[PDB]
Amino acid sequence: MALEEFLKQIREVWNTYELDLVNYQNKCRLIRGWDDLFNKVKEHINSVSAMKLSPYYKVFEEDALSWEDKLNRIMALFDVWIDVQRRWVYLEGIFTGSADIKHLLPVETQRFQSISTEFLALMKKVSKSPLVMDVLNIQGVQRSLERLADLLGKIQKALGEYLERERSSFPRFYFVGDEDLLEIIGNSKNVAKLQKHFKKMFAGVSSIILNEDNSVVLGISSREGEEVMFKTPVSITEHPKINEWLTLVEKEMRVTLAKLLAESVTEVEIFGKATSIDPNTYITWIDKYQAQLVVLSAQIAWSENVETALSSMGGGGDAAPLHSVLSNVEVTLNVLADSVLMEQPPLRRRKLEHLITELVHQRDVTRSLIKSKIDNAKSFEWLSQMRFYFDPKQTDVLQQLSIQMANAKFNYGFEYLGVQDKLVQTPLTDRCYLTMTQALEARLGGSPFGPAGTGKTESVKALGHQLGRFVLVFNCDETFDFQAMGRIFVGLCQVGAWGCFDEFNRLEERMLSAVSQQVQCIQEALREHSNPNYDKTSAPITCELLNKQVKVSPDMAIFITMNPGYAGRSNLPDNLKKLFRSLAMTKPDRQLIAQVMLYSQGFRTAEVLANKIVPFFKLCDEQLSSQSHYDFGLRALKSVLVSAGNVKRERIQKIKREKEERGEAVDEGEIAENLPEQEILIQSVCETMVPKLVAEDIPLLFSLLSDVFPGVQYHRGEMTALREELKKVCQEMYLTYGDGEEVGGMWVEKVLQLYQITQINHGLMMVGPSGSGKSMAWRVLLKALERLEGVEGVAHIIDPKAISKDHLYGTLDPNTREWTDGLFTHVLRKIIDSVRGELQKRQWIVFDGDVDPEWVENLNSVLDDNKLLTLPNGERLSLPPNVRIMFEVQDLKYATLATVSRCGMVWFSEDVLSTDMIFNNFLARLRSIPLDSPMLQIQRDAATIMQPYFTSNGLVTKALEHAFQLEHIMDLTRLRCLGSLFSMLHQACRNVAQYNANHPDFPMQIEQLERYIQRYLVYAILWSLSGDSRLKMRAELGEYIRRITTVPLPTAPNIPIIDYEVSISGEWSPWQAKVPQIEVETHKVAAPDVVVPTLDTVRHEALLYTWLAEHKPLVLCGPPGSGKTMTLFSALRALPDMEVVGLNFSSATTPELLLKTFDHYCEYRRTPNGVVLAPVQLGKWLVLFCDEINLPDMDKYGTQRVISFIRQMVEHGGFYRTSDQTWVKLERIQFVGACNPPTDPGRKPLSHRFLRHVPVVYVDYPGPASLTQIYGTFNRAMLRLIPSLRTYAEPLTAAMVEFYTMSQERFTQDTQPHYIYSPREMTRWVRGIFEALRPLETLPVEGLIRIWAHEALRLFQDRLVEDEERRWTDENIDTVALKHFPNIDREKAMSRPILYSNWLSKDYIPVDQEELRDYVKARLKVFYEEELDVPLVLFNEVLDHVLRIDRIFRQPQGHLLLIGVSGAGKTTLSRFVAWMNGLSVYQIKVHRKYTGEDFDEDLRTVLRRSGCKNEKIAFIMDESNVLDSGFLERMNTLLANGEVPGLFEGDEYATLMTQCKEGAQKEGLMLDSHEELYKWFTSQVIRNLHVVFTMNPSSEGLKDRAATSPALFNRCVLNWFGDWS
Amino acid sequence: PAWMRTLHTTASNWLHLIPQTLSHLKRTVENIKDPLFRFFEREVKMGAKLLQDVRQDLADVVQVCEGKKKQTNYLRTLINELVKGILPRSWSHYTVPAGMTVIQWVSDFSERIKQLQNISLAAASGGA
Amino acid sequence: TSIAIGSAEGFNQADKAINTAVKSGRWVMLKNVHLAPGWLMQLEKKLHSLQPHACFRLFLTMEINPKVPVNLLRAGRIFVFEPPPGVKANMLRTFSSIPVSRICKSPNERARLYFLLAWFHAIIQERLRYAPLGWSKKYEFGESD
Ligand SMILES: Nc1ncnc2c1ncn2[C@@H]1O[C@H](COP(=O)(O)OP(=O)(O)OP(=O)(O)O)[C@@H](O)[C@H]1O
Ligand SMILES: Nc1ncnc2c1ncn2[C@@H]1O[C@H](COP(=O)(O)OP(=O)(O)O)[C@@H](O)[C@H]1O
Ligand SMILES: Nc1ncnc2c1ncn2[C@@H]1O[C@H](COP(=O)(O)OP(=O)(O)O)[C@@H](O)[C@H]1O
Ligand SMILES: Nc1ncnc2c1ncn2[C@@H]1O[C@H](COP(=O)(O)OP(=O)(O)O)[C@@H](O)[C@H]1O
Ligand SMILES: [Mg+2]
Ligand SMILES: [Mg+2]
């Protein structure tokens, strides 16, 4: 009755729980408690789901299912209500607090009023009945919110121009997105909602301090908690509107900091030039003032001391008081060093670290001044230093501080920076400061350039933070166009902020030239500030940006950082480069950075540690092997140094934690004395460097570690708590867990290493070959951390290369300038907004796919310390601390150093995932997951039988090792074999169950079950490991198995094992028993659906059946025409409940071709678990057949987008819908691929990450004996038409096979790209003879040879280019015929002018050349008077050509590829023959403005006429008509399938259905279903539409043409008309 | 064709000049601690892989030019470069001066392998 | 009126500036026109059927690029700008580019400093001709420096 209690508890909770209401400005009663509502619903939903597992669920099934429906309906309603209420709050604020918007946008204002009325009406109902069930039962409440959400979104998108007007009134709004700005404007009274947006408008203001009323802004605060209290508080009541008090807050921030600086300077002067400093007073002064002012005060005091000392040294020979300046710095630095040797508050400790870094530089500068004997303040070695002059007598507090370097003078901006980590002030950084400040004085931009990881971006920000400026970083890409850059400049100019444009050379060259105009006009405006004649009490300086007059603040600056060494980057035009002063930052001063950082962190041996760690990184870059995922640069060094301080702090906390439970001897000073500082550094190195190492580099690095750090050992923490959770998660996921050298131990170490990287890096890559356990490593870790820490883990897995880069990050509208989020931007923005508590969960964004610089370099500012996603609309999204950016990849051969250096690396090797582990996983799943318990009992018994062979060094392991030594049509990977092997064994378990269904009396016993499984396992091993190899390789694996196996095998002397199947009785049975010598019905001779059983067909069909029945994706590979489509469709006939849809890939095929097929055959439905895509027809599995899956273009980074898209749908079971950024799950959809071998021209190798899911079967050309069996059967059937010709069946087949084999050898793809001969020609050969024999009552044997010779010429000679080739074909036709047909009259059978026609009679009989010439002249006379009055001269080749065209127009799907020189009559003859056969001629009427949608409309016109009106049409189209590659992607589908999946959409499809229903009615067919109508429409297009393609002979063009339109060369008959002879 | 015969002689001749053997350094507990062994082990390891790849590619070209194995996409790309005298990008594994042609690379690559052989011979016979 | 070419707005601005200038004698300079080879062909056809003011001049700035149409090259007069042939030519170009009043300011020693700068600029630029020996790399020491 425990289940009954849960139902009672669920019933009682929802009979009383009321929507918690709050009054909102006396207008309505909003709903709070969204977290309480959502968690409560989720908790009951889980409990209802969990109680289904209980066996006692049957009695309460209906009641539980009723509650599942109700709880799901509650989720679907209030997940929309929350977004509707949120949007209404800030839209209501805007449409009430700004009367100007009513006039500006009257339509939107009235539309919002109507929606605001329906919202308030629904609010009042909720107030009356706040019970959730009563609200849930409100009529149409679900649809009301759905309409409210959509309608409110339209109003939101219509306020864009209003938002652009408000951005001027507070220019920091230019750096805020439209939606966030509406929240800011609309919530101007609800100040608590404004807090999350301050980090976007300010450098270091994360929140504001408010009184209890929230009416006065008392001050500002940073993200670390540091507070600035305003001297004069800002009252919001006296300045209500949002943009004025925000301006007053920005001013008080600057005024308060300047006033606070003056007070700080007064106190710090006492510390300066003082013999002894009391630490308590000095620490008190540090704590009292902000971090930025504390360092600023120290710099001011030091500068004035040096100025004072140099002034006294005017006489030259006077004593130097500079030593006292050095003395004061030494004393102060000793106190700072002593303070960081002990525990400090986190804010004070960082302040102390900043002061140590500042004073180390002052110590170095003062030492340099003393060593150089400088005695004058005007000496350049002092002027070149950055100096700080403070005038307390200055009236304006904002101008009391002057920062001067050389001749450059700057005011301090007094932007609140919070606590920004400072750089070590190195000689490179000193040179950077000097160069950039020279550019600033010259009103020029700064252009630091160099390789990645040299400090270019950090130095620009450091200089800006030194000057108190708001520095904005932008990660530039090709989407930063002229309009986007200008708008960013407008914001920068009015705010007075610095723009640091990183990767600035990733802009297009045309955009760089255009931007140079905007940069120049700003710089001219900046020089207007510098003019002494200009007075501040005048018209403000203004430059023209985007055709508008924009005020320019003197504090703004432009900086660009670039790597000029990166190939593929844009070269800056010279006119742009003259606007920037460039500095090379190539060799950072690593040893100085390491020494100062370790000294500021409290390491006593910092000099010793720095002298070891920096050379150690240099040694690693050279001593260790070279890998693409190896980085030992400054980022890697910085990571270790920062981690060293963290490790030192935890040990000190750990040491005293031991002291708490062991005495009371806390003696912190002595605690730092006995502290293994070298061991701390080694731990940071190993926690950060070791996971990236390959196996053979691991001992090398530890030898290097012992070389540089003798006697120091690395010992990982034994993480019992995490390992216990990992072991449990592995058990629930059927995974193998090990410890140390056990099975799975290497993989568990990688999981633990991955966890360590997650705690040090916000961006990390898991790199390793396909099938290394990378995915399971982070999927298991995510679940384990949920159990260990209690924090829910959420993973968003993205295939970045399965979609366009526009769909990944988003697009800026070219005209409306509206921003649409991409997939990654939408996910990250959803987490930042945290509407449903995403900030309290562990959020992992996994980019599972290929890494190329084009898309991942948009994440440079995300993966570095900026933690910002910068968008071309000026918006900057901060990465929250709970988010990890992860990249699961198989290689990094296209990633640049910029990306590799910014991410933690965990390397997976194929040895990490052992084959024993994979075998355990398959067996564990087989013993627990039922395939349909009677079915599980079969699997469990079968698992016991398979177990001996799946051990290490077993049969399967030895077979796998031998298979890798063989040659395969595709690259061989371990998981492709095992994936195929496990699918086949699952089918064997289904076979035993199906046998038990056939034998309900006697189910299979273990003796028979054992006898079946062992042989099937051997059978499955051969096909899984050699099915993608040729017969000789399939054989050789057979003997090797025969040697090593103990399973009984067929005892035939010379018959390969691959020639045997396994009967359900556990006996080997030859495949030849299922290959009968059939006799084919005479009307089905060589018909497309007829398959003559051969040894290969029955084996391939059985193998295809197994994979298809398991819904396993598969690829058939073989030469064109080898029978791949025939075998697949033959196997599908024995597999009902499966519909096949043929897709024809080209070089230009994108995932969008798959999406159109989904739109036509499948529906998207909203389910409680997400969007599911399933076939429209119920109970059917829909098979996507891709015929040329390896043709799609491979980009320059080795990626095919559609292949990545298919890999996503197979491995993840779905894809992302780019319109709404929503994951779609596939249901009842499987994929089958066909392709030619990757070595063929135009073919690319398939990705190994796609092949692990897709078993490959190799279908070769039938051999000479197989061809004799196939077409000997056809010839016997077709020669039953003439009983007197039955005897000649065998010689006719032999002649066919001999000439076909000779032609296939004689002409190959090496000579011409279209010289492909396959059994397709044999099928056409038999069909052609059969069509010429049906209306014939009798025929002599010489008449048979003439038809045989005629069809050979049409099939083999018509495609030949050269006269020698045509001469050879003509001669060998005679040779072959007489060899197999002696005693025949050669002349009457082989007269060289072989012409056949049905023009002079009812039948297709031979025609005399002169008789044909007279008839064509007679018909040409009529043709001139009716269609085209262009006289033609009739020569012999024309008569042959018109007969060839006439043949194709009389065949279904008769398509022509006419190749020849222009003006040879290809079009005219086609029209003339089309007029003779009753075919209407359609030609597209191209012009200079003819575009793709013009071609689509033209395609619709032809398809309607031929598909609906039953009109025979010759669609004649030239190569010149192809104005775009998209034209042929449509024709490639049309030629092969007679249909274009996406051509008819919307109203066009509806009109087509009306016309098809009318058209089918005139034919007498009873069709009403749209699917039935579309199939009939396709069948009409197949029989009526004829496409004639005309093109000139171009060797390069013809070869390239095959990839663009493979249907042109396998669905069209090619006739090489060439030039006139 | 004329190119097919001329390229056959060149590839066969290159297989004569380029050495055929390169034995990896035997890793030892006390050899890993030797910095010279650590650098020299890298040289042979990357050198042996490049040596096998070039020899295999050249052997396939000879067999192609004898009409015994069919021309694949990789072979078509490699054969086109060899006819034009451009150094194949697959062969390019160590930094070289810009504008270096394939005939100079083969002679340069042959000398580097000889030195690599002597270094491994000393390590094999005599120790690190 | 000076216009950069790459932007779509730049094309519209160029046409309006040219149309206004051909009726008033105004000067128009279009920079980096090699970035728009297709638009350059249309500009050549536009200039052919036009009889502007006698003082009108159109300046096109481009890099030496094979993408520049032949028809435009034939219609215009080409001036090649490159490093001066030698030290003498380099220094004469420098002294012509700097206004005389700039050198001849109140400190008489300013003239010798400019000469030293001109000599230094000539020597540094001429060493670039010796690609490897003069400097390890082909630095872009130029007018901005
Ligand atoms: N620890 C483990 N124990 C047992 N089986 C495992 C383990 N880890 C992975 N496997 C299995 O072995 C295979 C490894 O797949 P996984 O997704 O982990 O590899 P991957 O390297 O991420 O793959 P890809 O390169 O295709 O992205 C799967 O069949 C998986 O079920
Ligand atoms: N002078 C310095 N002091 C401290 N850290 C530095 C210094 N210069 C660079 N770094 C660090 O080096 C890494 C790379 O700096 P970054 O500015 O991103 O380089 P770049 O822009 O050249 O790629 C960062 O971790 C940065 O903080
Ligand atoms: N056993 C067979 N029975 C009937 N036709 C066969 C047989 N083997 C080969 N063929 C012929 O070979 C050709 C194969 O065509 P298809 O299946 O489209 O080839 P692919 O898919 O390899 O491009 C057809 O003409 C088919 O009739
Ligand atoms: N057999 C012919 N006799 C006379 N004129 C011909 C003949 N074939 C073509 N022409 C001429 O060439 C023109 C172009 O014919 P068309 O069919 O468009 O050529 P193609 O398709 O080969 O480019 C015709 O309009 C006609 O003037
Ligand atoms: Mg940078
Ligand atoms: Mg994976």
Tab-separated table of C-alpha atoms in Angstrom, chain A residues 725-726 729-730 733 735 747 751 775-785:
chain	number	residue	atom	x	y	z
A	725	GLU	CA	30.699	7.347	-6.605
A	726	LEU	CA	32.424	6.613	-9.924
A	729	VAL	CA	27.894	5.122	-11.602
A	730	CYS	CA	29.875	2.652	-13.723
A	733	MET	CA	25.960	2.369	-16.754
A	735	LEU	CA	30.868	0.215	-17.454
A	747	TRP	CA	40.299	4.920	-17.891
A	751	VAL	CA	38.252	10.432	-15.350
A	775	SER	CA	32.450	10.597	-23.868
A	776	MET	CA	31.902	8.016	-21.075
A	777	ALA	CA	34.668	9.717	-19.042
A	778	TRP	CA	32.785	13.011	-18.770
A	779	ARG	CA	29.280	11.516	-18.757
A	780	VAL	CA	30.198	9.315	-15.782
A	781	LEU	CA	32.039	12.155	-14.032
A	782	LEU	CA	29.030	14.460	-14.419
A	783	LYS	CA	26.725	11.913	-12.770
A	784	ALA	CA	29.272	11.132	-10.045
A	785	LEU	CA	29.640	14.806	-9.121
